[PDB]
Amino acid sequence: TIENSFVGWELEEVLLLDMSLDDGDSKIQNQLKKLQSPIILLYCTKEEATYIFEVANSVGLTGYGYTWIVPSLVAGDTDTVPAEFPTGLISVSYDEWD
Amino acid sequence: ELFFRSGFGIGMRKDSPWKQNVSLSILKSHENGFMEDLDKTWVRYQECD
Amino acid sequence: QADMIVAPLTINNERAQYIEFSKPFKYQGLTILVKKEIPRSTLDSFMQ
Amino acid sequence: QMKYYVWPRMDDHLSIVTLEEAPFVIVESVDPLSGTCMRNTVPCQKRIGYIKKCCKGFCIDILKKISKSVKFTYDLYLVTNGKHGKKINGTWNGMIGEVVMKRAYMAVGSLTINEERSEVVDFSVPFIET
Ligand SMILES: *[C@@H]1O[C@H](CO)[C@@H](O)[C@H](O)[C@H]1NC(C)=O
């Protein structure tokens, strides 16, 4: 999309997370410390999503001035909120009400 | 050709009581034709072409 | 020892960090002054 | 179709007024293909129900370059009540008519320093002769 766009998009911090081995929080902490953008894209599942945000609030990314957007499966259910997500989380989900 | 433009200024020590009325008794000397009159009698009399 | 520098004093970023300036009372610039050479003239005889 | 024309959530968030002056602040309409402002222009709103235009020029490149050094955020919006300000029996209307009304907190554009306006707001250092 970026190549075929007159509008200017700034790309940065394209690093991924290899959350597979134990005691990776120290590695995650440096990975979480390399983000310097007002909005950060995150793509995980409902079970995996809560693990990442346990470190996100530790450094202090969550709050005003920072926005996180996740796919539909991160929320999982329309009402069953695990309360493990930062205030202001916005996501796109499949239509179910109509 | 002029390459560094910055006007003059009646500097004063920071945080001085007079710092506001001086900057308004200069802006009022431009409009009345005063500082265009001192310019006439001191700086713009012609002696050589 | 002085409270008001009534003189031609340019305003720039180094001085403005310690003292307070006013609104400019003259707008200027920097220009170069060089000696004017003689215009000369070549007309004394019509055999030129 | 978003129900919120502007995001509700917002002191580094400053309103800023501007007006169209021919060589300084040029207002060009939004590109039809994408409906968004292209490069080199900071998006600028408009009143009448809002329409998003795009602004660029000499007095805008100052705003982008200054904002980088002092690290704040802004959102321009064109003024729709008079131009540049004029005192009509105790009312100011224009780029200088909103800063006092506590709806602007800044006014970038082609203003002009003089005594009558300077009793209401306090201008910055001049940066061009006029
Ligand atoms: C500046 O002028 C105002 C106008 O009357 C006056 O009230 C004030 O005392 C003056 N201040 C100084 C420092 O001259």
Curated annotation (Swiss-Prot), chain A:
Coiled coil: none annotated. Primarily found in the fronto-parieto-temporal cortex and hippocampus pyramidal cells, lower expression in the basal ganglia. Zn(2+) binds at residue 96. It comes from the Eukaryota. It is found in: Cell membrane; Postsynaptic cell membrane; Cell projection, Dendrite; Late endosome. Phosphorylated on tyrosine residues. Component of N-methyl-D-aspartate (NMDA) receptors (NMDARs) that function as heterotetrameric, ligand-gated cation channels with high calcium permeability and voltage-dependent block by Mg(2+). Participates in synaptic plasticity for learning and memory formation by contributing to the long-term depression (LTD) of hippocampus membrane currents. Channel activation requires binding of the neurotransmitter L-glutamate to the GluN2 subunit, glycine or D-serine binding to the GluN1 subunit, plus membrane depolarization to eliminate channel inhibition by Mg(2+). It is linked to Intellectual developmental disorder, autosomal dominant 6, with or without seizures: A disorder characterized by significantly below average general intellectual functioning associated with impairments in adaptive behavior and manifested during the developmental period. MRD6 additional features may include seizures, hypotonia, abnormal movements, such as dystonia, and autistic features. The extracellular N-terminal domain (NTD) endows NMDARs with a unique capacity for allosteric modulation, harboring several binding sites for small molecule ligands that act as subunit-specific allosteric modulators of ion channel activity. Belongs to the glutamate-gated ion channel (TC 1.A.10.1) family. NR2B/GRIN2B subfamily. This is Glutamate receptor ionotropic, NMDA 2B. It comes from Homo sapiens (Human).
Curated annotation (Swiss-Prot), chain B:
It is found in: Cell membrane; Postsynaptic cell membrane; Postsynaptic density membrane; Synaptic cell membrane. Glycans are attached at residue 21. NMDA is probably regulated by C-terminal phosphorylation of an isoform of GRIN1 by PKC. Its phosphorylated state is influenced by the formation of the NMDAR-PPP2CB complex and the NMDAR channel activity. It is linked to Neurodevelopmental disorder with or without hyperkinetic movements and seizures, autosomal dominant: An autosomal dominant neurodevelopmental disorder characterized by severe intellectual disability and developmental delay, absent speech, muscular hypotonia, dyskinesia, and hyperkinetic movements. Cortical blindness, cerebral atrophy, and seizures are present in some patients. Neurodevelopmental disorder with or without hyperkinetic movements and seizures, autosomal recessive: An autosomal recessive neurodevelopmental disorder characterized by severe intellectual disability and psychomotor developmental delay, involuntary and stereotypic movements, spasticity, and inability to walk without support. Intractable seizures manifest in some patients. Component of N-methyl-D-aspartate (NMDA) receptors (NMDARs) that function as heterotetrameric, ligand-gated cation channels with high calcium permeability and voltage-dependent block by Mg(2+). NMDARs participate in synaptic plasticity for learning and memory formation by contributing to the long-term potentiation (LTP). Channel activation requires binding of the neurotransmitter L-glutamate to the GluN2 subunit, glycine or D-serine binding to the GluN1 subunit, plus membrane depolarization to eliminate channel inhibition by Mg(2+). This is Glutamate receptor ionotropic, NMDA 1.
Swiss-Prot record, chain C:
It is found in: Cell membrane; Postsynaptic cell membrane; Postsynaptic density membrane; Synaptic cell membrane. NMDA is probably regulated by C-terminal phosphorylation of an isoform of GRIN1 by PKC. Its phosphorylated state is influenced by the formation of the NMDAR-PPP2CB complex and the NMDAR channel activity. Glycine binds at residues 8, 10, 15. It comes from the Eukaryota. Component of N-methyl-D-aspartate (NMDA) receptors (NMDARs) that function as heterotetrameric, ligand-gated cation channels with high calcium permeability and voltage-dependent block by Mg(2+). NMDARs participate in synaptic plasticity for learning and memory formation by contributing to the long-term potentiation (LTP). Channel activation requires binding of the neurotransmitter L-glutamate to the GluN2 subunit, glycine or D-serine binding to the GluN1 subunit, plus membrane depolarization to eliminate channel inhibition by Mg(2+). It is linked to Neurodevelopmental disorder with or without hyperkinetic movements and seizures, autosomal dominant: An autosomal dominant neurodevelopmental disorder characterized by severe intellectual disability and developmental delay, absent speech, muscular hypotonia, dyskinesia, and hyperkinetic movements. Cortical blindness, cerebral atrophy, and seizures are present in some patients. Neurodevelopmental disorder with or without hyperkinetic movements and seizures, autosomal recessive: An autosomal recessive neurodevelopmental disorder characterized by severe intellectual disability and psychomotor developmental delay, involuntary and stereotypic movements, spasticity, and inability to walk without support. Intractable seizures manifest in some patients. This is Glutamate receptor ionotropic, NMDA 1. It comes from Homo sapiens. The gene is GRIN1.
